[PDB]
Design an enzyme around this catalytic site. Sequence first.
Site, mmCIF file in Angstrom:
data_model
loop_
_atom_site.group_PDB
_atom_site.id
_atom_site.type_symbol
_atom_site.label_atom_id
_atom_site.label_comp_id
_atom_site.label_asym_id
_atom_site.label_seq_id
_atom_site.Cartn_x
_atom_site.Cartn_y
_atom_site.Cartn_z
ATOM 1 N N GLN A 1 29.413 -6.641 -10.515
ATOM 2 C CA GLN A 1 28.859 -6.476 -11.850
ATOM 3 C C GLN A 1 28.415 -5.034 -12.073
ATOM 4 O O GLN A 1 27.953 -4.359 -11.149
ATOM 5 C CB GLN A 1 27.678 -7.417 -12.060
ATOM 6 C CG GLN A 1 27.961 -8.857 -11.689
ATOM 7 C CD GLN A 1 26.758 -9.755 -11.886
ATOM 8 O OE1 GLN A 1 25.702 -9.311 -12.329
ATOM 9 N NE2 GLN A 1 26.917 -11.031 -11.569
ATOM 10 N N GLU A 2 28.562 -4.573 -13.315
ATOM 11 C CA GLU A 2 28.164 -3.225 -13.729
ATOM 12 C C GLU A 2 28.971 -2.154 -12.996
ATOM 13 O O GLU A 2 28.424 -1.212 -12.423
ATOM 14 C CB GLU A 2 26.660 -3.018 -13.552
ATOM 15 C CG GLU A 2 25.863 -3.429 -14.772
ATOM 16 C CD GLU A 2 24.433 -3.798 -14.448
ATOM 17 O OE1 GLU A 2 24.224 -4.749 -13.669
ATOM 18 O OE2 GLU A 2 23.514 -3.142 -14.979
ATOM 19 N N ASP A 3 30.291 -2.324 -13.015
ATOM 20 C CA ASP A 3 31.330 -1.414 -12.534
ATOM 21 C C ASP A 3 31.508 -1.420 -11.021
ATOM 22 O O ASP A 3 32.290 -0.618 -10.517
ATOM 23 C CB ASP A 3 31.108 0.036 -12.987
ATOM 24 C CG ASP A 3 31.302 0.210 -14.473
ATOM 25 O OD1 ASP A 3 32.101 -0.549 -15.052
ATOM 26 O OD2 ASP A 3 30.649 1.096 -15.067
ATOM 27 N N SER A 4 30.835 -2.295 -10.284
ATOM 28 C CA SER A 4 31.141 -2.444 -8.873
ATOM 29 C C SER A 4 32.481 -3.151 -8.711
ATOM 30 O O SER A 4 33.082 -3.639 -9.666
ATOM 31 C CB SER A 4 30.031 -3.211 -8.162
ATOM 32 O OG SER A 4 28.767 -2.619 -8.377
ATOM 33 N N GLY B 1 34.733 2.854 -10.639
ATOM 34 C CA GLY B 1 33.586 2.209 -10.047
ATOM 35 C C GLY B 1 33.448 2.496 -8.567
ATOM 36 O O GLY B 1 34.128 3.360 -8.011
#
Lengths: 343, 116, 70, 257, 253, 210, 46, 35, 43, 271
Positions: free
Chosen positions: A51-54, A204
């Site tokens: 989540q959030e570009d991981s 990411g």
Amino acid sequence: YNVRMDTMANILYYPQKPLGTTRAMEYLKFRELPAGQNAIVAIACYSGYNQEDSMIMNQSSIDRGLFRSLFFRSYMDQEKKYGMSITETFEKPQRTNTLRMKHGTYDKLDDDGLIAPGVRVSGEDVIIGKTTPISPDEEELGQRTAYHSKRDASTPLRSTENGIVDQVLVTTNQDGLKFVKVRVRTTKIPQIGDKFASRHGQKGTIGITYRREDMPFTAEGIVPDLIINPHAIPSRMTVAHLIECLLSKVAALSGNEGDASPFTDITVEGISKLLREHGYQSRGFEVMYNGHTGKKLMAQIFFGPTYYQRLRHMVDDKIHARARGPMQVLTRQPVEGRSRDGG
Amino acid sequence: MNAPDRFELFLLGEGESKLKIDPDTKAPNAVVITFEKEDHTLGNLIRAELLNDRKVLFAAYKVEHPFFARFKLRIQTTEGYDPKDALKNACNSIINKLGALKTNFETEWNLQTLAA
Amino acid sequence: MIVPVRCFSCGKVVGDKWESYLNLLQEDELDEGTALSRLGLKRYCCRRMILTHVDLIEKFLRYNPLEKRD
Amino acid sequence: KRVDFSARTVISGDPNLELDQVGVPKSIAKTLTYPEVVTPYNIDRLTQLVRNGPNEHPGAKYVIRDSGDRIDLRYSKRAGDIQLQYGWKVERHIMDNDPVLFNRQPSLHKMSMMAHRVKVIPYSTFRLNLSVTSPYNADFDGDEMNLHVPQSEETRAELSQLCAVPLQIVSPQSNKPCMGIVQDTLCGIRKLTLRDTFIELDQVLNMLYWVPDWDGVIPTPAIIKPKPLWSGKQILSVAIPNGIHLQRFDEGTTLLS
Amino acid sequence: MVQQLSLFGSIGDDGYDLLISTLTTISGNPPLLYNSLCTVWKPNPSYDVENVNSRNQLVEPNRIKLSKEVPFSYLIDETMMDKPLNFRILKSFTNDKIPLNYAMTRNILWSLQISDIPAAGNNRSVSMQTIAETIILSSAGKNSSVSSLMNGLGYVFEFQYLTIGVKFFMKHGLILELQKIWQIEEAGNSQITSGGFLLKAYINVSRGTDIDRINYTETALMNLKKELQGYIELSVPDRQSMDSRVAHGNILI
Amino acid sequence: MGKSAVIFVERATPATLTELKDALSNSILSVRDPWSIDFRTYRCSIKNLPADVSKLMYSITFHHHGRQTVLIKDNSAMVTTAAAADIPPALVFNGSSTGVPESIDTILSSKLSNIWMQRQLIKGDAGETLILDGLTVRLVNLFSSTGFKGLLIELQADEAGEFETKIAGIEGHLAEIRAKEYKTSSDSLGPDTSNEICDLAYQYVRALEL
Amino acid sequence: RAEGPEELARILQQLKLDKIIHVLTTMFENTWSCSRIIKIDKPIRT
Amino acid sequence: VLTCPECKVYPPKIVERFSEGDVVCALCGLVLSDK
Amino acid sequence: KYICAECSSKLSLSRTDAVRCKDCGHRILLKARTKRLVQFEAR
Amino acid sequence: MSEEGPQVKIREASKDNVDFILSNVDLAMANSLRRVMIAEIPTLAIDSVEVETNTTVLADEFIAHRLGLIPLQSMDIEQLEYSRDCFCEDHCDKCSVVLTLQAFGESESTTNVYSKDLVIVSNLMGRNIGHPIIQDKEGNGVLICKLRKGQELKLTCVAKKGIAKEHAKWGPAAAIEFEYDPWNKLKHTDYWYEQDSAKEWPQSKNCEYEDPPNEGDPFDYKAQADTFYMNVESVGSIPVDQVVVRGIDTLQKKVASILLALTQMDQDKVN
């Protein structure tokens, strides 16, 4: 790249030319010197670690050599000639007649004062032995003893750099002084904290790595080399990412380069038709099973190859800590610089 | 680098017990059993087998963090029946099933080789 | 850079088939898809391994580690 | 000005960590320290820590006497020799549940510099719960944040009673929460609570085990016959505490929506 | 492994008999005769121990002590069976000659013991030393012998000596020893403690972490020292004299 | 003089111990308290060694025989104790001992760690001991670092007249349970000097070697 | 150290029972090899 | 001149820890001068 | 030992000799890899 | 025949692939079996290299990593020992295998260094192990490197025993297909459609082995997953039937270890 002693150099083990190429690339020679690899990507939610570009990555893929890069570094030194006498010499220092020796291991040095190719250097070791003669009238305020006729001027390695010395070169400069260049090799492997990017502004970091058993699989036993989150598509409107995925999948299944140049006649429906000729759901979805329990997944998953590039930022070059250490001459405050272990 | 050694996934450290049993303080006849150096492969099998015993009320497992190889199992059974006995019965049933499966596969493979 | 020995995804081995794959392309004048399927590459990940390989070992080989210019 | 006892590293996301807990890499935990005072309540553990040495976590790196002299444990062979007394100090590694201060630059407002409890982890990244990324205005595509370690008891109490993440939920700029369920947990908590979603027995058992505050009671199902099933609202109600009441009427909703 | 808390001193033999009377007046117990034989062994110089971590100094080579009790039938000559076996015989042990010679000790070849230099700092009132001890009960095999055993470990003989003296047991586990030391070589026997007796008062503590017990032990030792004021001066020896590491050679005697 | 023998089975199963316990149930007279045993190997870290000098040193720790360690090297044995109740009173009295010794394994692995370093460790816990007619049989499962290793059987008798017959009977009993690869040993370290525990440790070493 | 009247009654009943058992076991051994190892799950019906 | 006040050994053996800004006796581990 | 840069000729040089090749006369000289392979452990 | 246990129906087999149906079994058991078949079966692979001469255009750890993945015969791997258990120093004769590689580019045309040139110099003691796996027609096997005029490579390899839970090189199974319920009678997956879901989704090959559901039948809310269709392919080191059998044996041994530890703990509780 084999000869050149550049200050830094990065090389990729296995580069792959993209499955979807613009027609202009034939003039930039991007199919001769690529800069990435075709990675199988599954856009999905899986365990909440992307989540959030991981992103999440397959560890067996890492182990088999995906995104593995060689690293090359170099150093230089030369003898300086103060006045008419040579004030620097290339010779292995001895503790009998030397002062201010460094804590590094001088043992790896040869008799010439230069280490030889094929030796695993490590933190704070020395690779060039340099000694400075000192005039008798110069005394270090009582530090110098009777037999300390020379001073040490060796060059230790950077505190973190490790690896194998790869080349050593001896020449002379315009003034006829001796000149030594040392090139060092190392290998870099992806890990939690690295940086990857697709060709559409979607970059990411790796957030966790899984082994092939915990990876969701299709009915055919295929496994995603990486998994990204779908919460990145809407606000960015990168429909070209999805179209590139679809066309690359069709080209891999078919076996021919797929055009993706701008302002042309290719449409989404046409490639979907060409996809259904092979036997897959036309919108690129597929049935996938859970890796842990082996059940079926309620929702289908968008699945297919893409192109990714390994960027220049590694976590090993950004990590830094400090409890105490050297100060500054004037303000007496912790120094600046990560390579100089500052605050 | 901070990457832990891989062999910590299948070799117990010294002073490590492969099982640890602890009574649960909330529900009667309930035990929490910690297994070390193990993952879903064993926990899912054991829980699915423990769900077939009519005297077993509760049976659930979890793997708290995917960095460490260990997991917890929780069992609750009826009065006058020991959870350790339930675990033993489950393991015996699993072993018998696997033995029958192996014999069947060997018979079928030999028949195919005769037909090969 | 010589062909990867194994497939990064399904664990299969493709390293030995590169030499025979190159044969079908000009001796038999076949297309790429049929040549890829002629060698048992059926998952599209193995086809990805073989199809998109840049063989850079034939350029370093005409060269020495001593004296490149700029 | 530049300071000591600090670190800087990229971040990542960890859904298994609690709200106010941060994952600290092993080496960064081996470099920074804390001066613990030897007392009757800790001399056994502290002695074992000194015996461990500086190359092992947990361990120690220096021993300060009463007089101000400081013994480097690495050169002094006396990891197994030094006997500790009352009032000496052991500079030990940072251990689980030690408060730290954590921030991201630029620090525009109050809620960009918060306290956390450490958990020592492998690999090189920091770990954060996915709900504190909103006050920090931070994502995980390459951001680096800063870690500062307190070195006393008063400082530790200040970090634990003033700047803690739990105490920074209702922001005073606009008197409303600054954290909440975000991204994919939010996308999921909605698909779960539709009237369409029913759950069988085994999954209900695993889900109820996952809730660490469970009391061992199995909710009676909503469809007893001809097959026991559970509704997503029922399982999700277990997380919610008892005594919480909420009413919200949207457009065109009656007492039977 | 013990923490031994000790105080030292010496006396001239002239007062010896008067000292023994006074001790009996304080403790209430008589002296008990005893003897012992110690052999010191050092790591073999033929073997290069590169394993000593020179860049870190994790450990330094040390010397091992093997002790054994020897019956008095080896220490009493043909002139001395008439006297009974008690403390008075020490009055005749003033000559550098002794019945036990080199050949008998060579024919003999237990308690194995290792120690460290006392704790640093100048705020210590008694000599605190750390001792690691074990016991050898028996052996067997084709070369069952102390010499062969210590050569198997990697140690060789350095020297040996013989102690004869008396012991006093007081309250709280305090032990007071009066000793005479004879070094033994093939060249002959020489009494290092010539014309005097070496006095040593000590206590043992089993666990070094317990600090209430250590404080009590120090209190008892200082009270004992303050009792003997004016007669004998009990002092903390030199910290650099009780160092037994191979790199530097000296021997408190 | 009592006699002892040790038989080690390498290809055993987890349930083989129960099989042998039940197959002998007819003659089982009684059962006693469980036992344990430890087996370490220490290696020489010095390289300037002669060819004829061995490199290993086997340490066997017996828990039921009053906490005693035995060191073995080149058919040479050494027996050390660590309990305060095993100390000869002379050493306590004269001052040759402080009274609370340590096990020799601590000495090898703490102070002499630059000459000897540990290489393996094999343990056995919760064994069972059975009294048969003029015989005592002890069984235990051996666990290494990786996992289960094999089965260990040790037999002790007081009368040495019919020891061989008992060994043959136990071998036959293993034979009906189809354990056909077993290595047995009843050798003696010294023909003239007979020490029971040293001979037992030597038999353990001869059985457990690879 | 007994705690309950029912516990005391059970203790006395067991006292009588095992006293008789000991008497008869001694009678057998003074003339017979008993077994102290065998435990049956279900008591044999009378 | 810089000597250890506890070892009292001449000539003194001294190692400088640059990465910690310390001067340390190589025998007792004592820290002589900081920063 | 050393080695030339154009023809890779095998040369041995002292601490005072000129840094040149005997046959081609170039001013660029390379070392030679450690002939005795040395084992290492990566720590 | 064992009618109380899991049933098996082999339909296809070869040197590499086995294609079968597993019936009368839970889903957890089949999933655990496949997890063990991929992850936890020992095999023999190169685990250390030391190099004497390297005049190639590639690195050293590059060629080391290439060598670490070559497949070698490991049929009798039960008679080797984990090198962390063998009493030998470094590598044993009972706890390792040793090979040597030597090549020199004498000819003008470039010369390929394949995996047929690995030569074993240790003592095998009559065990079938260590042979390289060769599956191509020409017999050359895995190509390792490339040489020119005046280039040489000399090195020695030590191969050991391990599992796939620590590196992907020891894995004996490439990819295994696992399917069940092709008619979605149980309603485990929910389809995504534009107009007609029954037409957009293609049909699996397995539909011929079950009977299609009838629209007049209400949803059967009592069935459970019972029939699975698997296909297993091997890298080449181990025969595939041995892969299946060894997976079953390893699962059995794990459960038996659990049982033994539990019995030990119960005996401890008795004390």
